[PDB]
Amino acid sequence: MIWCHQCTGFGGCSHGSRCLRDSTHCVTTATRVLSNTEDLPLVTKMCHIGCPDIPSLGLGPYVSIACCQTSLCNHD
């Protein structure tokens, strides 16, 4: 278990939060949303025991997933 960013997005905000006792990795999903009118791309960050995939967060494709085995490895 480690600390990472669990922010919603709206450009790629930040928020150091404690991950799950089981989750020892961080995930970064940078993609658009279902909204037909947006000013910036959505960036949902979270933690997991590896590097899963959930393109359902948007329209499916055009989805990018960047995971890593490092605390708060979602920085810039």
Swiss-Prot record:
Tissue and organ expression note: Expressed at highest levels in cervix and esophagus, followed by adult and fetal skin. Expressed at lower levels in brain, lung, stomach, small intestine, colon, rectum, uterus, and thymus. Not detected in spleen nor bone marrow. Up-regulated 3-fold in psoriatic lesional skin. In the epidermis, predominantly produced by keratinocytes of the suprabasal epidermal compartment (at protein level). In attached gingiva, produced at highest levels by basal cells located in the lowermost epithelial layers (at protein level). Detected in serum (at protein level).
Relate the induction remark in this record: Up-regulation by IL22/interleukin-22 is suppressed by IFNG/Interferon gamma (at protein level).
Whether Secreted counts among this entry's keywords is yes
Record's Gene Ontology CC terms? extracellular space; plasma membrane; synapse
From the Swiss-Prot or TrEMBL record, state where the protein is found. Secreted
The protein's GO terms of the molecular function aspect are: acetylcholine receptor binding; acetylcholine receptor inhibitor activity; acetylcholine receptor regulator activity
Q: Taking every annotated instance into account, which residue ranges of this chain make up the domain UPAR/Ly6?
A: 4-74
What positions belong to coiled-coil segments? none
User: Which GO terms fall under biological process for this protein?
Assistant: acetylcholine receptor signaling pathway; regulation of neurotransmitter receptor activity
Chief location of this protein within or outside the cell: secreted
Keyword check for Transit peptide: no
Q: Which UniProt keywords apply?
A: Disulfide bond, Secreted, Signal
Q: What cystine linkages occur within this chain?
A: C4-C26, C7-C13, C19-C47, C51-C67, C68-C73
Q: Self-association or partners: how does it assemble?
A: Interacts with CHRNA3, CHRNA4, CHRNA5, CHRNA7, CHRNB2 and CHRNB4. Interacts with CHRM1 and CHRM3 probably in an allosteric manner.
Query: What this chain does, per the record?
Result: Binds and may modulate the functional properties of nicotinic and muscarinic acetylcholine receptors. May regulate keratinocytes proliferation, differentiation and apoptosis. In vitro moderately inhibits ACh-evoked currents of alpha-3:beta-2-containing nAChRs and strongly these of alpha-4:beta-2-containing nAChRs, modulates alpha-7-containing nAChRs, and inhibits nicotine-induced signaling probably implicating alpha-3:beta-4-containing nAChRs. Proposed to act on alpha-3:beta-2 and alpha-7 nAChRs in an orthosteric, and on mAChRs, such as CHRM1 and CHRM3, in an allosteric manner.
> Protein name, please?
Secreted Ly-6/uPAR domain-containing protein 2
Organism, by scientific name, is Homo sapiens
The gene from which this protein is expressed is SLURP2
